[PDB]
Structure formats: structure tokens, C-alpha cells
Symmetry: C2
Subunit: 467 residues, 2 copies
């Protein structure tokens, strides 16, 4: 009936908005890279471009939000949980918030600073759901909004099924099966539009298509390397709790310290400014970014960390791994650069999600999990250079496979969800990594749940949301 039209419109509109956002963000990232390379010889000028491009974009995000809608900052999942639990917010689901969030998120995603997309997208989609509901009906509420959430993450990860399931877990305590089906229908239409848009504009934005891996794995799967996948999970759960803890601590700190809050209220663009500056100054490729693959932007990181190669073996021969040759440093061993990437991007992601801009957490923690997973996988490939024999099969170590698992585990420990495995399955391949991933993500969730709250639940607490 009318609900069917609502779902179709939701999917279509979201796919279009998401595509547009991603397109402009990708074009901005290309200009970033091009401008940096245009100042090639001059090192001080390379620094200028490398730090000011993100600075301008993040400062713009903050300013735009502040001016248009100051409630279009900081994810959407925490506040959607509150709204779905009855407590409607202020001007959260308004049209100004839409404009603010969409433009400011595009700018944040085209800066290279590790900000998220999933959170803001859920809010963007819920605004669109509310708007579409008004446009259709007036020209329950929880049902409308919960489908919004589903298509938000569905169009964010470019993963229909996984997205719907993710939303259900992060935005609801008791879901209705009707809303599950409705969200799935709308998300499949979003994916349909995405496929048509792909045919139309080819290159444009590769909406999560770089994360499609090419792992030729044997179906039975080595249960001798399952302990490693489980260890990834356990450690990712611990690190997920550390992420949540440290993020909450910084989030509280900047306001709970009277002097800090006062100073930052007088100068609203000081906090985003300094954070962006230091992040970009540490990712400067001819500076510290050579030891942490700072040249790589969020998406490129995941695309290379999910490679079908073994960096530890092709270290003597770089320039053969493609875009994954930035991880091989002339001197520093790959393992140590993946470690430094993880460490550096841990604090970077924590402080970037604290900035007054639209920022979520999935992608930052996804690249962090991928880094941890890859580190483990590369060490496993160093410990087992000839592979591990199981029954009669010498299973070779695929470090990129470990990365996929690690990504799902850390991003499932931070968000307290087990649907990240499904998101990963659809973004990559499926079999021979189902059990490994399941074990890892479940173990991660367990450890993290026992230690700290979820990112969104912790943000609810920081903002003292009625919930």
C-alpha cells in the first residue's frame, strides 16, 4: 500500500543521497591527492597541502553544522536509540539537520581524517524517513524511523542484509519482524539503485566495492588456525573496550574540565582545528606517515589490508603488491608499520570522533580492526611460512583474511553487535570464514560487553540522554 511506496522512496532517496555524498567525497579525496602530488619537490608545500586540505574541510564541517543545525553533530545512533525509545529530541529530525549533516559529512569524508559514516547516515536516513512520511501520509513513528535506520546503514556499507541486521541491533532492544522485512525491502531497493548508478557512472564512487576481496580459500577451513582467529576476537574485544573507554574519557574531559569547555566555547573551531592538524601532521607521508602508511586514506587502507598477498614475504620485493606497497617500508619491517598504523590511528580515531562534526565510528574502528587482524595474519605467516597442515591440506596463511575477521571483531566490540560478521561476509567472500568470523566476533562482543559499554551507549551516557 502506502508503506510499500514509502519503502521504495526511502531506498531510492537514500541511495541517491549516499551516492552523491560519496561521489563528492571521493572527488575531494582525489583533489587532495592531486594537490599533494603537484607540490612534489617542495617538502614544506607538500606539508601545507597535506594539513590544510583536511583542516579546511573539517573546519567547514564544524562551522556549517554550528550555523545550520548544531544538533547535526556526533553520530545518530545514540540519539536514534533515544528517539526510538519514545523520547523525541529537539530539532533532530528536521530539514536543517539534513542539510547540515549531509554537507558536513561529505566534507569530513573527503578530508581523510578518520571520521565515520555509519552513524551520521542512520540519522540522515531517519530524517529522510520522517520527511518522506510527511510528504506521503500528511500530503507508527517508530516503524518509520527504524526502517530509516536500516536503509541508512545498508546504503553506508553497501551491504543490504548486514545493514538491516546491524541497525536492528544498535537501535533497538525489542524489534518487530514486520520492521525487519520492511527495512530489508527498502535496503534492497537502495542496492538496486546503487547497481543502476554503477552502470551509469562506472568509475564515479566505488561504493564499498574496493573491499570486495579475492581470497581463494579452501572450504573446510583450518581449525588449527582457529585459535588465532579466536585470539583476534579476544584482543579485539579488549581493544574495543579501550576505544570506548578512551573515547568517553576524552569526550567527557573536553567538557567536564571547566577551563577547557570555556575556552573551546569561545573558540569553537579550536578543538577541531588542533585535532585535525595533529592527525594530519602525523600522517604526513614524508614524516611519520612513512612508518604508518599515512598516505593511505580510510578506504584505501581497508582495500590494501584486505589484500590477497603476504606482505611479510614480498618485503624484499615491493612495487609488486600494488597499492599495498606503501606498507612495505625500505627499513622498518611491515609488521612494525602495521603496528604503528594501529597505534597511531587508535588515538587518531578516538579524538576525531570527539570533534564537533558529524562523525560515527564504524569505519574508523573497521580500519583499526583490519590493521590488528593483518598484523596477526602477517605474524602467522612469519611463524608458518610454508602453511599449516590440517588433515591432508597445507592451508596457507592469508593475512588479508585475518584482517577481515579483525575488522568485524573490533567494530563488533565497539558497537556490541554480531551483525558485523554479516556485513563483512557481504563485503567480501563468505564460506571458510564464517566460523572463524563468528567465533571472533562473538568472543569480541563477550569481552567488550564485560568491560565497557557500547560506543553509542557510552555516548548516550556522556550526553545524559534520557534513553
Amino acid at each position: 500500500g502506502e508503506d510499500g511506496i514509502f519503502l521504495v522512496l526511502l531506498g531510492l532517496l537514500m541511495a541517491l543521497v549516499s551516492w552523491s555524498m560519496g561521489y563528492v567525497s571521493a572527488k575531494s579525496l582525489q583533489a587532495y591527492k592531486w594537490s599533494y602530488a603537484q607540490m612534489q619537490p617542495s617538502l614544506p608545500l607538500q606539508f601545507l597541502v597535506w594539513v590544510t586540505f583536511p583542516l579546511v574541510l573539517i573546519l567547514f564541517s564544524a562551522l556549517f553544522c554550528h550555523l545550520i543545525s548544531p544538533q547535526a553533530v556526533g553520530s545518530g545512533i545514540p540519539e536514534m536509540k533515544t528517539i526510538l525509545r519514545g523520547v523525541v529530541l529537539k530539532e533532530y529530525l528536521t530539514m536543517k539537520a539534513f542539510v547540515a549533516k549531509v554537507v558536513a559529512l561529505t566534507a569530513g569524508l573527503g578530508s581523510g581524517i578518520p571520521v565515520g559514516k555509519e552513524g551520521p547516515f542512520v540519522h540522515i536516513a531517519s530524517i529522510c524517513a520522517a520527511v518522506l512520511s510527511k510528504f506521503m501520509s500528511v500530503f507508527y513513528y517508530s516503524d518509520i524511523l527504524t526502517v530509516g535506520c536500516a536503509v541508512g546503514v545498508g546504503c553506508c556499507f553497501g551491504t543490504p542484509l548486514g545493514g538491516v541486521l546491524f541497525s536492528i541491533e544498535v537501535t533497538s532492544t525489542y524489534f518487530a519482524v514486520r520492521n525487519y522485512w520492511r527495512g530489508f525491502f527498502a535496503a534492497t531497493f537502495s542496492a538496486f539503485v546503487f547497481r543502476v548508478l554503477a552502470v551509469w557512472n562506472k568509475d564515479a564512487v566505488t561504493i564499498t566495492a574496493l573491499f570486495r576481496t579475492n581470497f581463494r580459500m579452501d572450504f573446510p577451513f583450518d581449525l588449527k588456525e582457529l585459535p588465532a582467529f579466536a585470539a583476534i576476537g579476544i584482543c579485539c574485544g579488549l581493544l574495543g573496550a579501550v576505544f570506548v573507554y578512551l573515547h568517553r574519557q576524552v569526550m567527557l574531559g573536553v567538557r567536564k574540565h571547566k577551563a577547557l569547555s570555556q575556552f573551546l566555547a569561545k573558540h569553537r573551531l579550536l578543538y577541531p582545528g588542533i585535532v585535525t592538524f595533529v592527525i594530519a601532521s602525523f600522517t604526513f607521508p614524508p614524516g611519520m606517515g612513512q612508518f604508518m602508511a599515512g598516505e593511505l586514506m580510510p578506504r584505501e587502507a581497508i582495500s590494501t589490508l584486505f589484500d590477497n598477498n603476504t606482505w611479510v614475504k614480498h618485503a624484499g620485493d615491493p612495487e609488486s603488491l600494488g597499492q599495498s606497497a606503501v606498507w612495505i617500508h625500505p627499513r622498518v619491517n611491515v609488521v612494525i608499520i602495521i603496528f604503528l598504523f594501529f597505534v597511531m590511528k587508535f588515538w587518531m580515531s578516538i579524538v576525531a570522533t570527539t570533534m564537533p562534526i558529524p562523525c560515527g565510528g564504524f569505519m574508523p574502528v573497521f580500519v583499526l580492526g583490519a590493521a590488528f587482524g593483518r598484523l596477526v595474519g602477517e605474524i602467522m605467516a612469519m611463524l608458518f611460512p610454508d602453511g599449516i597442515l590440517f588433515d591432508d591440506i597445507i592451508y596457507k596463511i592469508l593475512p588479508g583474511g585475518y584482517a577481515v575477521i579483525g575488522a568485524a571483531a573490533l567494530t563488533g566490540a565497539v558497537s556490541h553487535t554480531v551483525s558485523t560478521a554479516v556485513i563483512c561476509f557481504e563485503l567480501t567472500g563468505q564460506i571458510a570464514h564464517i566460523l572463524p568470523m563468528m567465533v571472533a566476533v562473538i568472543l569480541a562482543n563477550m569481552v567488550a560487553q564485560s568491560l565497557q559499554p557500547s560506543l553509542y551507549d557510552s555516548i548516550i551516557q556522556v550526553k545524559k540522554l534520557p534513553y
Copy 2:
């Protein structure tokens, strides 16, 4: 805490019970085939073996159930829905029911008669959940039973994630996310045990491992053949409604007709007897089974219908497709034999799920959907012998891929679920068939929901369950 132990025990116990059941059922199917082949020259004796083996096993199933627990018949999902909605039944979750169901289902699955496994398994698992809860705690209830449901279908399809999601959709109207995580943990442990059991006993029972396909498909996917996948969905929705309708009509008919019910009450083994006899007499390979691949047993059918070949092209050259050469009849064209399989197995499945034995519906309708899908795919391969060019890629038709989609669509129209796509994704490959399957299953659900109730909802109505 104690819940973690409950989940681990549930998964372990279910994996063991399911494996044992499947092992004995597979050994029975092997004896069936062996005995049939031992009477090779004598056609009347081949008939005897072909019809009496299933007869004995089904009559035994019925008798065992009747004697031990007469409430261990007819699926479990319909009655689990009722129990989960507060209305506890009689001696449904008792230990006699366990024995009855497990033994009788093993016999029904080793007969070759199209009976299901998913439904009874959900009941078997819920009994085990209740028993484990008593064993643990005494030595809420809905939470315990819900996890049982999840691990039941998880160990049935050998699909952890898909199973959990399936159960949520078929046994609940409003699910809690806690139960989702709990069910997932228990189902991943079930899968873990299954992997260990596989290593241990190798051949034994190939727990849904024959359905693992080898489709080398191109990622972008032909949107020019998407209309065909959508048509599969629409038609599968119509056929799913016909299945439900006809099954309900037969189910009501046998009791609503006074004379029939009276006669069948005096002779309880008459109905199962005659149904089994006629099904087996029509699947007799040197009789009518040559035109409907009756030699193939439920699992073998799915394994061959999910082949990476094109029967329409290798018809002049059979004995090269392997076990899929039974579909190529010397005279009758493959397409017509797949059609006859579908038609014959449609009524067969409808009347087999009406028998007084433990019987579900997933697998019967899964093979029916696979047949329909394959028929479409083979016709598509006949209409497009050189493939269909999209952008710059000549996508070749993979009839087996269409079968996977058809299976998910018809089994999602009968059960009114969209999680069958995920079950299929995990049973087979994933990418390049996500959107096709999603579209198909959603369209199937839509058409079917608009026409008839779900199988389980219709059974609830037949049995006048309070629900």
C-alpha cells in the same frame, strides 16, 4: 554466567543429536540405494525394494510417534509460535517427545519421501533447551526456548547466521536483541562441533556440504537477467501460496471429512501407507522416475540442481555431468523432466507433510524451488546460448545459480521469511547473487503474503492453536 554454559551445552548437544540423526539417515539412504541396486536385473524386485524401504520407515515413524508421544508429529514451528506466545501446550516439551521425534525423523529422512527436517528440529532443539535449562538451573522460559529454536535451524541447515535469523522470523512477532546474540553464540558453537565432527569422521554425513556450490560468477552481475530473477520470485510467491493452500486443504480434508477421519482413526497406518506407496511408486526410477529424476533423493536433488553445468547444452553428451546426468533423459528434454520433477514433487511434498509423522517443510519446498529456478535458468540458457552482454561483459547463464535463487524464493514464500536468502548465501557463495536473491525473495514474500498465510500460520489455523 550460567546462561553461557546453557548456550554452549545447547549448541554441543544439538550438533551431536543432529549429526547422529543425519548419520543414521544417510546410512539408511545408502542401504536403500544398495538394496535397490542389488535387485538390478529383476524389475519387480527393484519395485519391491523401492517402495517397501520407504514404506517400512514411514510406517515405523508413524507407529513410533503414536506409541511414544503422539504430539511429536507435524513440525514444531507452528506449536513453538503458540508456546512462545504464552500458551504452553500439553506434553510438547517432554522427554518422550524428544525420543519420538528424533527416531521418527531419522526414519523419515532416510526414506527418501519428501519430509522436512527444519520444523521437527526446532521442536527437538526446544525440548533440549527446556531439558538443559532444568538440568542446569533446577539441578525467562521464552528466552530459553527462543535460543532452542535458533540452534535447531542452525544445526538443520548447517547455517549458523541464517538459521538464527530464520528462527527469529518464523517463531516470533517481537524479538529481543539479547536472544539474537544468545542464539547466535549457541549456533556458532553448534557449527564448531560440526566442524570437529567432520574432521573426526570425514565421510559420515555430509551435513549440508553438498549444497556448497562452485559458481564462478562475475561480481558486477548482469542486471539484464535481473528481470528473470524477479520473475522467479513472483512465480515462486504464487506457487508458495498454492503450496500452502493445497497443503491446508488436504490437511483439513482428511479430518473434516467425517468418513475419512473415522476410517483413518481405525486404521492409523493407512494414510501414511498409501501416501508413501504412491509417492514411491511414482518415483520408481524405471517407471515414472525416469521422467522426473526419482532416483535422486532430496539432498542429491539439491546438489545436482545447484550444479555449475548447463544441462540444456550437455544433453547430447550425458555421463559427463556426474550425478546430474539423471536429469538428462535419452528422449525427454531436460527442461521437461525438471518440469515434471517440480509438478510431481509438488503434490508429493504437499501430501507427505500431511502424514502423521514428524515432518517440516523447508527441504521439500527447497528442492521444489531449486527445480523451478533451474527450469527458468535452463530456458534462459536456451534463449541465450551465447550469454547476455551487459556493459562490456558477456554474462553466461548459470542455471544452477537460478536454482539457488528459486530455492530461497519458494521456501521464503511458504515460510513468509526473507532470511532464506541468507541461509542460501551461507550454503553457497555470496556476491553477485545478493541483489538477485534479495529481489526474488522479497517479491516472493510479497506475492505470497498477499495471497495465503505462511505454512506454519496455516497449520496453526488447521490445529486451531490458541496462538
